[PDB]
Design a protein around this ligand. Sequence first.
Ligand SMILES: [Cl-]
Lengths: 158, 159
Amino acid sequence: FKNSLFVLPYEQRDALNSLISGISSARESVKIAIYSFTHRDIARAIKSVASRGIKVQIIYDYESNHNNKQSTIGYLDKYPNTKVCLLKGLKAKNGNYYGIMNQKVAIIDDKIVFLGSANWSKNAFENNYEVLLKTDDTETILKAKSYYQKMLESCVGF
Amino acid sequence: EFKNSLFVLPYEQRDALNSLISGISSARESVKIAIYSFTHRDIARAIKSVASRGIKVQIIYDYESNHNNKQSTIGYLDKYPNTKVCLLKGLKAKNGNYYGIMNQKVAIIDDKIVFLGSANWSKNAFENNYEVLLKTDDTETILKAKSYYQKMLESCVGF
Ligand SMILES: [Cl-]
């Protein structure tokens, strides 16, 4: 097994290329959980692999994507083999507020998981300090796939 | 060979916090941190606790989030023994008159552990949010995180 760390902005070109190549070369499934997802090269890699027949699921943060014209959620909602939904975080202990869905995770087939600090935005891949980790570690992948299904429980239609 | 430990929050939020807190607390040499938002007082106390034992701690905070924020831990940790705090803004946007952010949430412990993932160091993240937190001892990842950490440290500015 291999971990491939990308430290942005230093490695921002390689990081975006790695994420786009991982989504585009999927054979079966792409499962994504993302807080913010505005980036149009990445939405086109999704659109491209869904057109090859791959099943894509995308969980977006509810508060920040349910009515947000810069989110790709509107753009991808209609798309063949592509299921998008919205997830709120848990009821808080502080106030009457709900948490956020702040993950930035992509799971490709049974083969690769991407995680780290980067939202899917031009800002993240051009202007920010960030970290993106790609891993083929099977135990990592299995746990991520298991909890992704669990999350899907609580997610709702766009 | 290495061990990835993934925590998926909120399901594993207490195990996640406890892993991170234990990783910092038991450091024997150094703690290197780059964090976007850091308001969680128990994690700050854990930093104080280990800095009190003579471990060197360095913390890069996001500049806009931390330069003037009473809920930030930067003020609480600034002049603490063995503790270096500083601020870092991102790059200028190619077609805008604004700068990026320092959005990493990373802790490097000795040469032995790196913690990375989505979670800001807040009660919000450890109590209410979906997040992921990954612990690894993979030495290639650790060396690389250390190398760029040093480069980051040369761009950060005083608090
Ligand atoms: Cl974030």
